[PDB]
Design a protein around this ligand. Structure first.
Ligand SMILES: [Ca+2]
Ligand SMILES: [Ca+2]
Ligand SMILES: [Ca+2]
Ligand SMILES: [Ca+2]
Ligand SMILES: [Ca+2]
Ligand SMILES: [Ca+2]
Length: 395
């Protein structure tokens, strides 16, 4: 009866009453790209096409969480802090006395099923809690809360607190924007994801560049996250989503996503974009996971990953979804350390980068090169290493 559709518009010519006229609804007018999410009856899609200036009509595609409960089972096994093997594998703990992410200009946004925001091992690091489900940006704690468990896990992988209890993240001091883009079942429309990406550059104040100097990420006066981490993917590549991705990147934000769990020969979207670092999964033997989609950029612990889980609990999951937050957390350390030393963050790399000069190049060079020498289709450049990466960033 009604269908959701994302129109790419001439914002000069385009009038939302026109769609309202044809029985439609306006879902979300993008702040950062000339586009608008709409509901139209099926027959109107014709009409919608040359509304002035509707220049492109794109359908709303489905993306899916990329982490699942592990074969080995189980919880936090002791009433003290556990360090999950993957945290130690990506060489995080030795960085912390330099930084643990707690540099205050630095935020990581995590677009997922939501967060258990008052989790005793998360709560202090959760700086903003948004949902974008169904096109409506909500900031109600009841809407922004994790109905699934996955985003809670993925977040504790980046940022669980270094303390008494539970687990610890790669960056246990970094601030987290939780942007709920996937429903209770872990399904998400691209539109909601695109909006989430926009919410992550806007930050809590709804403005991309308050103060007008074209510095977004790494700007103390702006609320923009510096990392957007997506433990999700789907098979569709739409141009308004890719445009949003180019908005993030241009803001100087590092974008990180799961390669996918299908054993496919290349990454899903958004991982498959040049501007995103595609992350594949290793196990505790440094073998590539056979589920891990091939031709990632880097790989990271992704099998039998103990992390935070609702409600105030912990669980062990697996997938390229679990690998991803290790990479994101390793970026957060890079940028935090870099900022703490120089007045400034590093630029996002490119995929090709083998320089000490960007986040991505440093990643690529300090990674632990497993399998065949150099970048390979299983490991990418290899397994990411916080300690060596932060040493490069500051050397
Ligand atoms: Ca802890
Ligand atoms: Ca600024
Ligand atoms: Ca400024
Ligand atoms: Ca920031
Ligand atoms: Ca709770
Ligand atoms: Ca290799």
């Amino acid at each position: 009866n009604t269908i959701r559709v994302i129109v790419s518009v001439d914002k000069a010519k385009f009038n939302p009453h026109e769609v309202l006229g044809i029985g439609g609804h306006i879902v979300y007018q993008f702040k950062l790209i000339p586009a608008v999410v709409v509901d139209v009856p099926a027959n109107a899609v014709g009409k919608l096409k040359k509304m002035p200036g509707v220049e492109k009509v794109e359908f709303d595609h489905q993306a899916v969480l990329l982490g699942k409960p592990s074969w080995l089972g189980g919880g936090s096994t002791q009433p003290a802090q556990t360090i999950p093997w993957g945290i130690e594998r990506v060489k995080a703990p030795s960085v912390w006395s330099i930084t643990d992410g707690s540099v205050s200009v630095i935020q990581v946004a995590v677009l997922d099923t939501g967060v258990d925001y008052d989790h005793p091992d998360l709560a202090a690091n959760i700086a903003w809690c948004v949902s974008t489900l169904r096109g409506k940006v909500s900031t109600k704690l009841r809407d922004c809360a994790d109905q699934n468990g996955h985003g809670t896990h993925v977040i504790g992988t980046i940022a669980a607190l270094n303390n008494d209890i539970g687990v610890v993240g790669v960056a246990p001091g970094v601030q987290i924007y939780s942007v709920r883009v996937l429903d209770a079942r872990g399904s998400g429309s691209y539109s909601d994801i695109a909006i989430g990406i926009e919410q992550a550059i806007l930050g809590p104040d709804g403005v991309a560049d308050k103060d007008g100097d074209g510095i977004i990420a790494g700007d103390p006066d702006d609320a923009a996250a510096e990392v957007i981490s997506m433990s999700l993917g789907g098979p569709a590549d739409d141009s308004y989503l890719y445009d949003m991705i180019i908005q993030a990147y241009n803001a100087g934000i590092v974008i990180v996503a799961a390669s996918g769990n299908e054993g496919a020969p290349s990454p899903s979207y958004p991982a498959a974009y040049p501007e995103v670092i595609a992350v594949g999964a290793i196990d505790s033997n440094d073998n590539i996971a056979s589920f891990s989609n091939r031709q990632p950029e880097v790989s990271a612990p992704g099998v039998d990953i103990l992390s935070t889980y609702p409600d105030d609990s912990y669980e062990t999951l697996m997938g390229t979804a679990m690998a991803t937050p290790h990479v994101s957390g390793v970026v957060a350390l890079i940028q935090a350390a870099y900022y703490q030393k120089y007045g400034k963050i590093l630029p996002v790399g490119t995929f090709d980068d083998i320089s000490k000069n960007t986040v991505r190049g440093i990643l690529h060079i300090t990674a632990d090169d497993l399998g065949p020498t150099g970048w390979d289709a299983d490991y990418g450049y290899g397994v990411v290493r916080a300690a060596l990466a932060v040493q490069a960033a500051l050397g």
